[PDB]
Every structure is written in C-alpha cells, then in structure tokens.
Write a protein that binds this DNA or RNA. Structure first.
Length: 97
RNA sequence: CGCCACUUCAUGGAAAUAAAUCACUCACGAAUGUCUU
C-alpha cells in the first residue's frame, strides 16, 4: 500500500549541479560556472517524476500538444499536477502523485 | 810512348697544430570574459 525504496545513484561521468547562475540578474550569465556538491531536493523529485513518466510511456515529445485530457488526469494522479514550489511550504501533503 | 776501365743510384726527421663550437631577435600577439531559448 505504501512501498519504500532505497535509490543509489552512481556517477558514470563528471556531473554538474547548477548554482545561482549569477550574483545578480537581468541578462548576465556567469563566465565561471561552479558546481554544487549536491543537487537540490527539487532535482531528485523531478528525476523521480521523469522516470515515472518514462516507465508509463507518457512523455512530452516534439513541439507542443495538449496531452489528451484523460492522459492529463492519469499523469496528474501519477506524478501530481505541479512541480516543487516553496509557496506550499506549510502544506500537510506533498501535493504530488 | 803504347794500350786499357771499373764502382756507387736515399736514407734519417717533421705526417698536422692552435682560435672560434653558435651569436642576436622574437618566447606567444589579436578576438571571445559568456551567448541563445
């Protein structure tokens, strides 16, 4: 009913985890891009959602579509209807699928 | 005064010695220091 897994990630090559991308904003990029030693938990959650959408073959491919609202419902109940945001940081549930 | 020829056919020494053996210049120059979604 509620199965728990342990997921181990083995780096097969050199990895790069993004930073602030800038000490300011506007249009500037950073000439030196530094790698965080750890990814954000948002990255882990998005990886889980993407892999779940890969197992159940419901992926967003090539320009743009509307994804067959029944498929929209199944994707909502699989991965949730929304990404990780800190607006719902006090919500009692993860809000995902 | 007459008559008359033989012998010998390079050895020893020096057989390369000093000077210069790379020198000067250039030893990186210019563009890009983030860009497009």
């Amino acid at each position: 009913m509620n199965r728990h897994y342990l997921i181990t990630l083995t780096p097969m090559d050199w990895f790069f985890f993004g930073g602030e991308r800038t000490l300011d904003d506007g249009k500037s990029a950073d000439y030196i891009s530094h790698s965080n030693k750890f990814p954000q938990q948002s990255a882990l959650l998005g990886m889980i959602r993407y892999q779940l959408l890969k197992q159940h073959n419901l992926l967003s491919q090539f320009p743009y579509t509307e994804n067959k609202p029944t498929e929209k419902e199944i994707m909502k109940t699989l991965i949730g209807e929304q990404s990780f945001r800190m607006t719902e940081r006090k919500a009692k549930s993860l809000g995902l699928g």
